[PDB]
Amino acid sequence: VNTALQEVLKTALIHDGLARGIREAAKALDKRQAHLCVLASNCDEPMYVKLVEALCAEHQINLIKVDDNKKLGEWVGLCKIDREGKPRKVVGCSCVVVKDYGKESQAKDVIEEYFKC
Amino acid sequence: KSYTTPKKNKHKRKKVKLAVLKYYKVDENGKISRLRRECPSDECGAGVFMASHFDRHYCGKCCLTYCF
């Protein structure tokens, strides 16, 4: 669920196993070293939505939908300025391709059985 | 120091709007199409791509320039 996504993004942040952005994320997806994929839908996407769905609909690739770019951008740790409470300005990240090495969590297991269901 | 000779400028680099979405072509069917070329070297397996010039195709870092 969303707190499981928050935990796996924090684990990827502290273990540096993450590919933020879109260009190196597409590099990682065409590199075939991918485990999970996320997307914030209903944004200003005239064609990026169909590009990213035809990209993520290849093989072994999962999906998690977020309401806006501002929330997963906070979970990935993109822009952290003035961290004493609320941040100053956080820019939204579109998609995240994540490598998982420290896969020891109950949240990982419940999100994995959410993908498999 | 302002001298009577004209002053040169550093190269400003022109900003492209969503170039990666121009490489992969998405039609109405379940297929993915590659417009420009790919990379054949052992350093970059399938990741980076080549330039679409009018008389050659230039690699990003491997310098495999193939001219027609």
Curated annotation (Swiss-Prot), chain A:
PTM annotation (N6-succinyllysine): residues: K116
Keyword hit for Acetylation: yes
Biological process (GO), any one: positive regulation of canonical Wnt signaling pathway
Keyword Acetylation listed: yes
Subcellular localization, as worded in the UniProt entry: Cytoplasm; Nucleus, Nucleolus
Cited InterPro entries: Ribosomal_eL30-like_sf (IPR029064), Ribosomal_eL8/eL30/eS12/Gad45 (IPR004038), Ribosomal_eS12 (IPR000530), Ribosomal_eS12_CS (IPR047860)
Pfam families: Ribosomal_L7Ae (PF01248)
UniProt main location, coarse: cytoplasm
UniProt keyword list: Acetylation, Cytoplasm, Nucleus, Ribonucleoprotein, Ribosomal protein
GO molecular function annotations of the record: structural constituent of ribosome
Recorded GO CC terms: cytosolic ribosome; cytosolic small ribosomal subunit; Golgi apparatus; nucleolus; small-subunit processome
Subunit structure: Part of the small subunit (SSU) processome, composed of more than 70 proteins and the RNA chaperone small nucleolar RNA (snoRNA) U3. Subunit of the 40S ribosomal complex.
Membership in a protein family: Belongs to the eukaryotic ribosomal protein eS12 family.
Known function: Part of the small subunit (SSU) processome, first precursor of the small eukaryotic ribosomal subunit. During the assembly of the SSU processome in the nucleolus, many ribosome biogenesis factors, an RNA chaperone and ribosomal proteins associate with the nascent pre-rRNA and work in concert to generate RNA folding, modifications, rearrangements and cleavage as well as targeted degradation of pre-ribosomal RNA by the RNA exosome. Subunit of the 40S ribosomal complex.
Protein name: Small ribosomal subunit protein eS12
Species whose genome carries this gene: Oryctolagus cuniculus
Swiss-Prot record, chain B:
Modified residues (N6-acetyllysine): K22, K31
Localization in the cell: Cytoplasm; Nucleus, Nucleolus
Disulfide-linked positions: none
Zn finger spans (C4-type): 39-62
Residue location of crosslink Glycyl lysine isopeptide (Lys-Gly) (interchain with G-Cter in ubiquitin): K25, K31
Stretches the record annotates as Disordered: 1-13
Domain of life: Eukaryota
Entry PTM: Monoubiquitinated at Lys-25 and Lys-31 by RNF25 in response to ribosome collisions (ribosome stalling): ubiquitination promotes subsequent activation of RNF14, leading to EEF1A1 ubiquitination and degradation and rescue of stalled ribosomes. Deubiquitination at Lys-31 by USP16 is required for maturation of the 40S ribosomal complex.
Self-association state and partner proteins as the record states: Part of the 40S ribosomal subunit. Part of the small subunit (SSU) processome, composed of more than 70 proteins and the RNA chaperone small nucleolar RNA (snoRNA) U3.
Function: Component of the 40S subunit of the ribosome. Part of the small subunit (SSU) processome, first precursor of the small eukaryotic ribosomal subunit. During the assembly of the SSU processome in the nucleolus, many ribosome biogenesis factors, an RNA chaperone and ribosomal proteins associate with the nascent pre-rRNA and work in concert to generate RNA folding, modifications, rearrangements and cleavage as well as targeted degradation of pre-ribosomal RNA by the RNA exosome.
Name of the molecule in the record: Small ribosomal subunit protein eS31
Gene: RPS27A
Range of the intact protein held here: 83 to 150 of 156
